[PDB]
Write a protein that binds this DNA or RNA. Structure first.
Lengths: 311, 314, 317, 317
RNA sequence: AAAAAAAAAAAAAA
RNA sequence: AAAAAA
RNA sequence: AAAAAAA
RNA sequence: AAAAAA
């Protein structure tokens, strides 16, 4: 009784990976989602070439990709995913032809094509969400060389254009920078570096992250934050008996209003009214089983905190 | 009985919306003004395509809009506005043709066309003023995600280039930024973010906002300010007998061009962002309010209007 | 025995303004230099059109200007300057033909044209200096609205393009910004906002500003600084007996030599914005002292931390 | 005896400059490599004109250059370099024709032309390395005007576009800013401002800079750092017996491995620029140490917090 | 040169 | 969640 | 100080 | 207030 969004992803993953797809390992799920995203974006070998306005170098790249032999059954995608013989049929029948537009399919009135396009959009959104979660998980232990200043970190994650398109509000990077650093329309979404993304194992089954479900410290931190976030958020996780790298969630951080006062009527602008009158003393709000609590900030990034506490 | 702008706005609104147009509802007036602005800007479905210098994407969008069926009679506008069967006649008659210019009509010498063009200009100005007021009102209890720093807030509101063209002195946005960044000639008007705009229910009637008018706190604040201004402006309002929702205006803020307080580096010295703050705590600044008895000064609260409105209601 | 540069300006002003041109009032000289500069840039009515690559709107503007009737004798320029009949003759005979280039005149070899072009260049430089000084003088009591941040104030004065062309070392504005926001060649000049410019009454007669020569407070301040600069420079002037708005110069600020104190990050070290202050952490900026060259010797004066504009406004009453 | 790159540079320099080319003088090699770069970028008088997309002004400049007479044999280059009569032969033979591309020659299949193009690429790389090192060596005792803020100093050195193209990993300037602001592809290289460039007299010989080499202090400092680096790097030098001017290298700094010390705002918290400096508000940034690899082993030297330009002039008094 | 992330080369190159 | 869309 | 040289 | 004008 899962939503069509997750059912489409489950069916696609099954058809493309046979029994080798394990629905309980975050790494396997993330790799499968990335492969499906690449397949549906027309980026694999042997697929159509993006030659609408491609430059000469991009022209040659796309031509080589199209001429390159497409993947074959039995290929190892990642570590524990093996392509089956049915993957070609799924790619041919479900992936929209390059350049397909929803308006054209809707005007055509073809129910099958409309449903296929809707499923494609849902799959793209789910795969992009999984990609964002995986990037957050990776960033916990290995930071990107580009992130050397607060401005650079402001646009994390750094994903591709299609990722930004499918989920504009969760994907940072160059496209989010351009959208923010440029003219913005009514349908503009602001990047949410800490939007709660359930782990892929919970995302694909419709399970919503909450208090009382077993998870890993890295898993929860990625779900609720990324590498450079404050380490105080680690208080949201509590190890179980014997540790064993598996604990439990005890709360989730809260996030909304502003306190800006624009200079008006000869007054001087204020960045924050509360400030007028303490940075290390700032506290975060955690929603516990009993009620909201305020926890003093650690002042150390989750990356540095994990590095220090590793040994 | 009314100026030309108010009279033409009332005539256009009545003709377009029948009796459904409520003249005492601010939301209805704002919706009608937005619809009229869209109509006169050829932004509605089935109107002339803007293709003079349009890029391929803009050409496609305009062609799609033109091919799309125009709004049908009886269509619901906003919440409590319904189009009449005679709106198409007014759209075809009173709307200047795309690319029309005042100089061309003046050369033509047709007095009726000159009157029509002046009416169109006045209607655009009135609609843009109403749009600015409604944007301010929305900002009071609905923060704009586009604003994250004082620089972003400096250009509020963010509206289309048509709005800036009609009322450059009241509309900010990207076009205002472009105008400010370039030179500033004699015709350039600085973006008055806190210019006094009577509420739409008063603007169309022409009753200039003044002390004693029965107005809501939110609407008065929108008229005199917007979401991200100081909460001290709330002192310009006073609930009437029995509390309720409508109070009375007790004062009007004034602004006397706060002088500069900067010192550039020279002869090896170092620049100072503010001579006073050098001496970083300063809440002594006061705002001048013109009350019936006289002009007084109120100490700033230093707290955002949006914050204060939600906090005091808890 | 004045230099040819100032002689040319004096002759031109006389020819164009008759006896109405006073060589002792600074407002009069500012207006005269502004008009003459306009005349030698073909920006007055009835002069040639700069149609080399003009846009449609600029095309219409210049066409209307060319068609527009030229100024007539007896016109009032400013407040105390009246044009004469000889102004048309001087314009025709001394104004280079629009688009004239010094290279072409030199190649042709005509001595008269070479001298005329040299005179025009000198007159342009003189009029640009006077315009810049008047910009600084007006900036003491009425700041430009464009000045709201130090970034904006870094380019003052904001003058037209030809002004920047003639005198690059004093004129700021969009053109100075563009030259800086780019690359510098072998002949790139650095904007010196506070370069000393003799007051116009002293510039047109060759008198060099020094100590012991009567001036007005605002005159000297515009000469050595402008509206936003520090108030300490006010100490360079001392009122005379009975005040009377006329005092005397007691010193001229000594401009410090360019010496950056940055230390960029390297080898894992951390960037420093200023070597001097980072060490002890004395972030206060109210101790820095300016150098004033007095009759006796160099002295250091503590800064006041308040703008000359605000200082004059407050001390006005 | 030498790799291809150094061999080709040696051959070209010898051919063009005869015996006037001294192989142990840094200024001589810098001037020679700059001239050879000019020749190989068609920036000398009497070479093809760059007009592919050149703007009207650029078209005029290039046409004037082409029309201008080319340098004549025996012309003085820099200070102690003189052209021979056989430089025209080398310029005509080994210089690729304007607009040549490696793909075109590869399609041609002429082995001689492929070798000549590879030699041209290697000579561009060598000349750009020498140009960068001389930029640093100038910066030690002559501050560049363009550098006024840490943002300005982030992009040193400021060189031409061809320099950035040939060696992107050392050369800054306008093109480095352009490439950094835009998309960062796989081939994108960051500006390693303080990369080790052996001194010219070591670079052409192929002798890698290491411990024990007899190097003047200024040249070593230009090798490892530049003008606005911290003075601590001066500890890598130790004057030899009898003081003199030539000392020896005692170590070679190491680029400290990255470890992010930032905390972005989230869940209502405030972003922190530096966790360490935060502490309890104590901003004492003088504990940072630079690694130095000595013969005995790796050590750490406490920073001095002063610019190399300042330190070099201060210690000479 | 810390079963799987600097230096030099070859494919790319205002 | 439905709609729209390099 | 000599040379060069626009929305 | 008026006159210009994507």
């Amino acid at each position: 009784e899962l939503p069509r969004n997750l059912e489409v992803f489950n069916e696609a993953c099954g058809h493309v990976f046979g029994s080798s797809f394990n629905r309980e390992d975050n790494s396997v799920i993330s790799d499968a989602a990335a492969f499906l995203f690449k397949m549906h974006t027309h980026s694999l070998d042997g697929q159509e070439a993006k030659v609408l306005r491609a430059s000469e170098k991009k022209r040659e790249r796309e031509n080589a990709k199209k001429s390159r032999k497409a993947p074959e059954a039995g290929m190892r995608v990642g570590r524990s995913l093996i392509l089956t013989s049915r993957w070609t049929e799924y790619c041919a029948t479900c992936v929209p032809a390059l350049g397909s537009k929803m308006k054209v399919i809707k005007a055509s009135g073809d129910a099958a094509m409309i449903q296929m396009m809707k499923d494609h959009n849902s799959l793209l959104r789910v795969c992009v969400r999984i990609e964002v979660w995986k990037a957050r998980y990776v960033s916990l232990v290995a930071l990107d060389e580009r992130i050397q200043t607060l401005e650079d970190a402001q646009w994390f994650p750094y994903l591709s254009g299609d990722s930004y398109r499918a989920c504009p509000g969760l994907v940072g990077g160059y496209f989010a920078k351009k959208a923010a650093a440029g003219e913005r329309g009514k349908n503009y979404k602001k990047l949410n570096q800490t939007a709660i993304i359930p782990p892929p194992r919970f995302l694909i089954i419709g399970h919503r992250l909450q208090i009382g479900d077993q998870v890993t410290l890295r898993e929860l931190l990625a779900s609720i934050a990324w590498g450079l976030c404050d380490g105080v958020l680690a208080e949201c996780w509590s190890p179980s008996q014997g540790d064993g790298s598996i604990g439990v969630v005890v709360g989730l951080p809260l996030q909304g209003s502003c306190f800006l006062v624009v200079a008006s009527h000869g007054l001087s602008a204020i960045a924050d009214s509360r400030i007028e009158g303490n940075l290390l003393e700032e506290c975060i709000a955690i929603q516990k089983q009993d009620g909201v609590i305020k926890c003093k900030r650690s002042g150390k990034s989750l990356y540095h905190c994990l590095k220090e506490t590793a040994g």
